[PDB]
Symmetry: D2
Subunit: 243 residues, 4 copies
């Protein structure tokens, strides 16, 4: 997370950490608990090539990574069939936990936005995670969960921004319709935050509007963060995740 | 180049090396001379973002990288407007030299194929360059130019292989039409070769079938190398490079 | 620490972690509290060149590094004047805190040995620290304090083994007299433990016999670990630390 | 080599490069041809631990490393028996080639100074090699042989300088008697040069005064380069190398 702060221990009860087996269960991506037994994340975190479940684990809300670990096994990895690379799109996936988690005031699901919801450009949104605090510079120990308020921006203006200083023709889409963008040169998500949540408080309830996907560097000029637009894949998520 | 041998001094007179300014003029990609004032290379080597031309230099055929440098400055970088990422396509670009090159038998241009050339499986093709000799294994000094004979396979055959061991749906095209594939588990191009030529002798004439673009790793199972198909972009090329 | 286990919270109340200022206060060496205002460590951890005291802090016993930091500033760095490299010898040093620390059951000083104590082989000792768990293998987060029981061997036994497989003449002493030797191919201290303590339980009381100094690698064949012999420098220590 | 320039191909005909077997025969140290069949070098380049001759090779005077390799096998490695580490001293070794070389104007022995020679302070001397052009800064390709003119410094003065900004007591010897020193903050030898020659023109003839040994960094203030004084070991060298 770039330009942010350690998050209060009572914020973001849905933030999750994805672990991969090695010398130790190391964090490689974020995620969000959208259902007692399901984790929403980015497909490029667990694909396009098939992964071995035995090597994956899930860690729920943690103030400092690695400290109070209680890894949870994954029963299934569901990666959107239309996904190949994040720049192309469909960068969303689901993780079915082997057991439902006992939700608490400190650890519960986040709400999915209704199919009609349209997070207006400029809405107050937050992105959370243990990703780098800047380009090429890791989050220092004890690895606190960071947060930052990033302003959402219209898809067209973002697509436009990405063409500035680029050879790509103006009518060629870079930021596509199944994506959404947010952040500026001082606030953004970064390597290690992918798969994590982009939530906005609406009416008086927190809705996940995006999933940290990709972007050129972190907090770079005319290069805001790109996220998978959740509303766009609501039907695909609901084909697996109940209500 | 994976699985080749050092190339004889009399072969590949069109091979070039692109250098970027730094502690020394380092080789980052390959290229080919298609005209006394033009070089053809991969769009991802010099884009999608605009670069400082002054920081770029071109080196004509050399038996050993850095050994006998006579760097040539560049006046224009022309990247196919449809390009953004190699996996999406249009991974092609043009470099105009500030001065025309004097051709000879050791240094001359390569012949581009006729718009109808197909390069079917069983055609004799070679790929050259100063890239890695294997995944994460750089070409050791004195850095000789290497060459390797690569088997060409039909696009749909490679497309099917890229779907093996992956979540991407079978009907979701991976190896695209403006692409060409070649190589196997013992013969392939690798990192550092991008932008270089893939030439096949057709009726006593060498033709550049493709430009080294991308692949999942190098010489990996079910992951043949992918090259941008030159015949697909002849019209574009000719909008800049005279006949 | 190679070949050990996580130490229980009630053990090694004198262990300390030295921290150098940087993106975060990083651990570079161990140490021991021998007085409410003094810390004993290796001279190679802070010299032979003078350091900027401001960039150095001390962390008292922690079950896990970086998680419960309560860094303490240093006012003096006193390195034995005989020191230059660890191999030569006199690898001992003192740190004076700016304020005395409040002692308790979880954190108090270690008892220095009487001048006549030899710590003969057989007699079991332990070495503790947050160093690598093997050659080139870092202690994984959450970075627990480790401990390991190491067999003490006579100085001449170790000296003889250090000459095995070496060109150094047998009569050119390697393991010097102001040094002490312990550990084997399965139990040893490693990079990151230098400066820490080697303690042996004598008459129901724990005594610091050595200070983690050097060795050729960690837990390697015929290369037991080498520690500064604390009894050799008692007089020097008392020239600064009260009795 | 810090400071200095690429050497004319007619200079330093006795300089050699030591190669160790890996992905390619890589340069790890410099050396000098002092006899048709012998190479003088630094003990730490090939010790203290015993080495496998099969994995070692010698490359004679080359203008650009790796480009015109003609590796010569080594039959014997004689490391001075009093050597253990560069700081302690006796950092000198001998390499017996398996075949005498056919000396020429381009490649021939350097001459050893007479046991009486002293090389006064402020003497014009040159050190050469393919080592780093600066602290942590590799000599870039095409790897030209470099040279620099460095001023000899009186031993006492060097020892004195090494005590400035250090905790080592003033009467504790750092730069020992079997050592010699030269260089300043602009000119010095560096990592990659160790084992190389330090020659001075005396009475109109080139004599090797030292072997590149150690130093605190390269060209650092009050930290001149330390070399193994050759005159000091003439007797040891002549026990093997014919007069
Ligand atoms: C993320 O941090 C994002 C960055 C998001 C933008 C940066 C600034 N604005 C927002 N990802 C990123 O995708 O950028 C480029 C690609 C389109 C991130 N960090 O790392 C990645 C990529 C990645 C690294 C490592 C893994 C991994 O370990 N994967 C697998 C999963 C698995 C399960 C079981 C057993 C083994 C494995 C290995 C995955 C993805 N993106
Ligand atoms: C390439 O080596 C290729 C190899 C292609 C396949 C591998 C096996 N079968 C064939 N491919 C590759 O796709 O890399 C990954 C991304 C899609 C290659 N090497 O490096 C790249 C990418 C790349 C890295 C760094 C640079 C660079 O330095 N660029 C610029 C050029 C420039 C000019 C002036 C001033 C500054 C710069 C920076 C370029 C490309 N691909
Ligand atoms: C040690 O781990 C020891 C381990 C000892 C043996 C290995 C197996 N058996 C036991 N050994 C070691 O030999 O080190 C090298 C040579 C004598 C160790 N850890 O780290 C070091 C070396 C070292 C690294 C980094 C620093 C450092 O950062 N120092 C200073 C302190 C400081 C304070 C304030 C401002 C700046 C600084 C920089 C020091 C030493 N050895
Ligand atoms: C040297 O460059 C010296 C530098 C000289 C000073 C700099 C300014 N004043 C002079 N540096 C140095 O640090 O000296 C040693 C003591 C602290 C140098 N280059 O590399 C080294 C150390 C070194 C690196 C790599 C090897 C190596 O690979 N050795 C062997 C030889 C061998 C043969 C067969 C099979 C295996 C091997 C491994 C050795 C030494 N110092």
């Amino acid at each position: 997370i770039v330009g942010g702060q350690e998050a209060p221990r009572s914020k973001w009860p849905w933030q999750v950490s994805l672990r991969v087996h090695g010398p130790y269960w190391m964090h490689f991506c974020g995620g969000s608990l959208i259902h007692p037994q399901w984790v929403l994340t980015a497909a490029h975190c667990v694909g396009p090539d098939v992964k071995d479940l035995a090597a994956l684990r899930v860690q729920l809300r943690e103030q400092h990574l690695y400290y109070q670990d209680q890894l949870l096994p994954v029963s299934r990895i569901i990666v959107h069939p239309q996904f190949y690379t994040a720049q192309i799109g469909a960068d969303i996936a689901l993780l079915e936990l082997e057991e439902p988690v006992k939700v608490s005031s400190h650890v519960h699901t986040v709400t999915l936005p209704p199919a009609s919801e349209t997070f207006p450009p400029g809405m107050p949104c937050w992105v959370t995670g243990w990703g780098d605090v800047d380009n090429d510079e890791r989050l220092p120990p004890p690895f606190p969960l960071k947060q930052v308020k990033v302003p959402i921006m219209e898809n067209h203006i973002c697509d436009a921004k990405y063409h500035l200083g680029a050879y790509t023709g103006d009518d060629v889409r870079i930021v596509r319709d199944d994506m959404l963008c947010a952040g500026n040169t001082r606030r953004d998500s970064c390597q290690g935050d992918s798969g994590g949540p982009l939530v906005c408080k609406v009416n008086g309830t927190w809705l996940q509007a995006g999933v940290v996907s990709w972007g050129e560097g972190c907090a770079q000029p005319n290069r805001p963060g790109i996220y998978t637009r959740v509303t766009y894949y609501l039907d695909w998520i609901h084909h697996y995740v109940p209500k």
